[PDB]
Amino acid sequence: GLELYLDLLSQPCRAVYIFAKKNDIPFELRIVDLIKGQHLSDAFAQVNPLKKVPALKDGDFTLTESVAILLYLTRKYKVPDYWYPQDLQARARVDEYLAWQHTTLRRSCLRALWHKVMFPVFLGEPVSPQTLAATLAELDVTLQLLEDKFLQNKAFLTGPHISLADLVAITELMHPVGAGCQVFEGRPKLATWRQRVEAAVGEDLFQEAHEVILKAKDFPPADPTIKQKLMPRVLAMIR
Amino acid sequence: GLELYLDLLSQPCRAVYIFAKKNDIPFELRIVDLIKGQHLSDAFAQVNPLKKVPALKDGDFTLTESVAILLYLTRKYKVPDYWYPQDLQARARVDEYLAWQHTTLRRSCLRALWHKVMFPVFLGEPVSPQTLAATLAELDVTLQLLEDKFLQNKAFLTGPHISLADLVAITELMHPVGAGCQVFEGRPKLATWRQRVEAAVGEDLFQEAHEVILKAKDFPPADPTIKQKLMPRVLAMIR
Ligand SMILES: CCCCCCSC[C@H](NC(=O)CC[C@H]([NH3+])C(=O)O)C(=O)NCC(=O)O
Ligand SMILES: CCCCCCSC[C@H](NC(=O)CC[C@H]([NH3+])C(=O)O)C(=O)NCC(=O)O
């Protein structure tokens, strides 16, 4: 009874989805449709009281946080070593990235998607161009840190092989890709890394997991009641 | 040997300090004085190019991020396993808290200190009552989530014993305590939990680690050159 409560629109759900499918981990997929406000229902509030996705249920055990969910599945299903290496220092490099991204690249990628596309297209709320400029400037800074602090001259973020870190980072970078931002343009080292990550994960799986975010621009505007319920949740999300 | 680059004024450094000292981990303490902008010096930039503390140095290996540092020390020095339990679901509970706090409690506790004390006292910069109110209301939301999602009816955040999760949370909560917020007042579940954490950590060590944050209201204001150097760093920290 392993169940993953996911919406492929969100960066953390894509990381969990790709991981579980790549490693042939059997699970029931429960799609929690975020644009319909399904995560705000009483039925989802029973699974996760915080009313957020991804959420994991394994028997009677409930787990939140994509980093925790990824580590739980890594250990329980005994996946290959490269995802979270046995080696003390390689493991630490994975921990370093997973910790760093929460307050930096996660935030920057999220704010890029919402200020450029999901506020004016989906919630019908225009964003000032000064706010959008500042957001994309901050995106540039985090992308530069991704290159200079993590990737540097290596094949992958923490070493010669893909790890949990590369999975979290690539699903994050696809948020502004879906928003139409020039993420990999003029960043050749990131561009070749993306292609290496796509191959390690499986290109077909990569494409499949990113079908929803790549069409975020074509979302019909929200329902006036749905917009009302989602607005404080989104404002607390974007900070 | 092992070197820990710390400033006990900051929440993540206190967590690392308390962990290394409680577990009798031999290290060389390198105080990096934030108030004097020592983290911005060319000498510290060699240790950590990101110019932030805590930073670990163990020979040719350098590590950032307090969560990564705590886990690396956990593993290398074979500390008691209650800090990071071997049981999969208990270890997940620790991972769940460590992941959650980065964008919620860490952020509120850091903003409480800066908007209530460190901007007006140390940097001579007034904060609007509206900004401070917003910050302290968000702190109350995170304190309620700490109680309702994590601590609940248990002795500690993840079960019957202390873990790395309690260490991160207690050092976070002492940031608004040092700013003069009535954190444990009217929250009896948190107040008794604090007493259990202090008892488990050892009261003398707990007090030693918190000597600087409890004196933050009395820091002499920065001169105009130090202020000018620290202001863009502080604004990137306080978004
Ligand atoms: C139509 C879009 C609705 C809102 C945007 C969804 S972004 C995804 C977001 N997920 C989280 O905030 C959990 C983050 C957590 N740190 C993790 O990694 O698991 C969520 O479900 N948040 C939902 C919410 O807070 O309302
Ligand atoms: C009085 C100076 C103001 C410093 C405020 C915060 S001190 C803590 C801060 N450290 C971090 O941002 C690292 C956080 C990281 N997520 C961790 O847990 O280690 C820092 O060294 N920041 C220094 C900087 O960014 O300049």
From Swiss-Prot, chains A, B:
SUPFAM superfamilies assigned to the protein according to its UniProt record, in alphabetical order: GST C-terminal domain-like, Thioredoxin-like
Top-level taxon of origin: Eukaryota
InterPro entries per the UniProt record, alphabetical: Glutathione-S-Trfase_C-like, Glutathione-S-Trfase_C_sf, Glutathione_S-Trfase, Glutathione_S-Trfase_N, GST_C, GST_C_Theta, GST_N_Theta, GST_Theta
EC number(s) from the headed UniProt entry: 2.5.1.18
Molecular function GO terms recorded: glutathione peroxidase activity; glutathione transferase activity
Catalytic activity reported: RX + glutathione = an S-substituted glutathione + a halide anion + H(+)
Binding residues for glutathione: H39, K52, V53, E65, S66
Enzyme class: transferase
GO CC, alphabetical: cytoplasm; cytosol; extracellular exosome
Domain GST N-terminal: 1-81
Paired cysteines (S-S): none
Keywords for the protein's UniProt record, in alphabetical order: Cytoplasm, Transferase
Subcellular location: Cytoplasm
PROSITE patterns xref list: GST_CTER, GST_NTER
Tissue-level expression: Found in erythrocyte. Expressed at low levels in liver. In lung, expressed at low levels in club cells and ciliated cells at the alveolar/bronchiolar junction. Absent from epithelial cells of larger bronchioles.
Keyword Transferase: yes
Domain GST C-terminal: 87-219
Single GO biological process annotation from the record: glutathione metabolic process
UniProt family annotation: Belongs to the GST superfamily. Theta family.
Function of the protein: Conjugation of reduced glutathione to a wide number of exogenous and endogenous hydrophobic electrophiles. Acts on 1,2-epoxy-3-(4-nitrophenoxy)propane, phenethylisothiocyanate 4-nitrobenzyl chloride and 4-nitrophenethyl bromide. Displays glutathione peroxidase activity with cumene hydroperoxide.
Subunit structure: Homodimer.
Protein's UniProt name: Glutathione S-transferase theta-1
Species whose genome carries this gene: Homo sapiens
Upper lineage: Eukaryota, Metazoa, Chordata, Craniata, Vertebrata
Gene: GSTT1
